[PDB]
Amino acid sequence: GTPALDRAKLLKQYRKARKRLFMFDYDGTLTPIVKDPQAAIPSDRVLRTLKTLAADPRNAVWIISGRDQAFLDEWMGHIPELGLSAEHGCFIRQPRSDDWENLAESSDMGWQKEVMEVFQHFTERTQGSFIERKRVALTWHYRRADPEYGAFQARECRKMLEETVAKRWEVEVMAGKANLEVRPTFVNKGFIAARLVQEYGTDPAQAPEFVLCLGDDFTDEDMFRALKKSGLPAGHVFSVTVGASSKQTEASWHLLEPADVIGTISMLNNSS
Ligand SMILES: [Mg+2]
């Protein structure tokens, strides 16, 4: 459980900070969960609120989303002051830059060949299993094997990956329900968050003195944890989950709904 975000405490640090960093999850945070996600086009109120926040040059405003580059480009990209992270960190656009960077193509992807060979080995041993490739992640699915024998082989596979591949390459080995996924570390929201803080440089006088980090599910927990280990003074950082007061989280605060998130940002926009 967490306390409701203390708006007085938030506003005071906002007013005191010389530079400020905002990291917003999109779906379920800035905009409500909906039945059809091609729905979830952001309202004019969301866009207006973000436009006003990002217009202050003291502010660095980031939108961090699983949504495709095309989506963010079309519905957010017309506000050039927004930093954008699309497809879970694979494509990044710095604020005020018209220049998307492809992190996949600039990183060492040699790990995919090795992971494929390992997965091929256990696929041969595990009837019912198969490999799924996505553009940056590789997944071995084994839901169709006997659960006991499946988990036996998944333990052996993970061990092989962790001791070989994950030592040589900057990747993470993730266990899902009945699958193993390997993916670059740059796809982890906590990696993204830590990197955004690191980009301010080594000069501690140059670190942002206000950080607001907002998200609604388990993928955002990674950001909250990353910020805890960032070395920033605790009173400068507000990690906020969107959800119930009773929600278990690494965040320090909660806001109940996306409307309350937009309402909080609007307060900051009306600070004058
Ligand atoms: Mg979300």
Q: How far is the CA of 219 from the centre of ligand 1 (A)?
A: 8
* Angle between helices 258-269 and 7-16 in degrees, nearest 10: 40
Q: Are residues 194 and 158 in the same domain?
A: no
Q: Give CA–CA dist 262/78, Å, rounded.
A: 19
Q: Are residues 204 and 79 in the same domain?
A: yes
Q: How far is the CA of 30 from the centre of ligand 1 (A)?
A: 8
Q: How far is the CA of 5 from the centre of ligand 1 (A)?
A: 18
217 annotated as ligand-binding: no
User: Which value, to the nearest 10 degrees, does the dihedral of the CA atoms of residues 88, 93, 94, 96 take?
Assistant: -140
Select from 86, 85, 83, 119 the least CA-distant residue to 98.
83
Give the structural domain span for 140. 106-187
Give the C-alpha distances (Å, rounded to integers) separating 108 from 38, 115, 170, 187.
33, 13, 8, 14
Resolution for the entry shown, Å: 1.9
Contact 66, 75 (CB under 8 A): no
Catalytic residue, candidates 6, 25, 73, 222: 25
Select from 18, 88, 4, 85 the least CA-distant residue to 264.
4
* Angle between helices 218-228 and 189-198 in degrees, nearest 10: 30
Select from 80, 86, 74 the least CA-distant residue to 98.
80
State which of 187, 209, 243 marks the end of a domain: 187
Q: Are residues 224 and 261 in the same domain?
A: yes
Q: Are residues 182 and 251 in the same domain?
A: no
> How many structural domains is the chain composed of?
2
Residue 56 structure tokens = 């202050």
State which of 160, 187, 214 marks the end of a domain: 187
220 annotated as ligand-binding: yes
- Which residues lie across from 33 on neighbouring strands? none
- Which residues lie across from 31 on neighbouring strands? 27
Contact 76, 63 (CB under 8 A): yes
Residue 95 structure tokens = 């604020």
Residue 147 structure tokens = 């659960």
The 3-state secondary structure of the chain reads CCCECCHHHHHHHHHHCCCEEEEEECECCCECCCCCCCCCCCCHHHHHHHHHHHHCCCEEEEEECCCCHHHHHHHCCCCCCEEEEEHHHCEEECCCCCCEEEHHHHCCCCHHHHHHHHHHHHHHHCCCCEEEECCCCEEEECCCCCHHHHHHHHHHHHHHHHHCHHHHCCEEEEECCCEEEEEEHHHCHHHHHHHHHHCCCCCHHHCCCEEEEEECCHHHHHHHHHHHCCCCCHHHEEEEEECCCCCCCCCCEEECCHHHHHHHHHHHHCCC
| Class of residue 168 by CB neighbours under 10 A (exposed 0-12, middle 13-18, buried 19+) | exposed
**Using what technique was this structure determined?**
X-ray
State which of 187, 209, 242 marks the end of a domain: 187
Q: Are residues 145 and 173 in the same domain?
A: yes
Select from 23, 29, 66 the least CA-distant residue to 183.
66
Question: In the annotation, is 217 catalytic?
Answer: no
Q: Are residues 100 and 194 in the same domain?
A: yes
Site of tokens 């329900």: 177
Q: How far is the CA of 103 from the centre of ligand 1 (A)?
A: 22
Q: Are residues 150 and 57 in the same domain?
A: no
Select from 223, 237, 214, 219 the least CA-distant residue to 191.
223
Q: Are residues 80 and 40 in the same domain?
A: yes
Maximum alpha-carbon separation in the chain: 66
Q: How far is the CA of 174 from the centre of ligand 1 (A)?
A: 20
Site of tokens 């003291």: 58
Select from 78, 59, 79, 82 the least CA-distant residue to 268.
59
In the chain, breaks (C-N over 2.5 A) are found after none
Q: Are residues 44 and 156 in the same domain?
A: no
- The backbone torsions φ and ψ at residue 122, rounded to the nearest 5 degrees and listed phi first, read -80, -25
Q: Are residues 252 and 214 in the same domain?
A: yes
Q: Are residues 198 and 213 in the same domain?
A: yes
- Measured between its terminal Cα atoms, the distance across the chain in Å is 33
Q: How far is the CA of 73 from the centre of ligand 1 (A)?
A: 18
Q: Are residues 132 and 195 in the same domain?
A: no
Residues 6+ apart with CB under 8 A from 136: 90, 104, 109, 183, 184, 187
Phi-psi region of 133 (alpha: psi -120 to 50; beta: other; left: phi over 0): beta
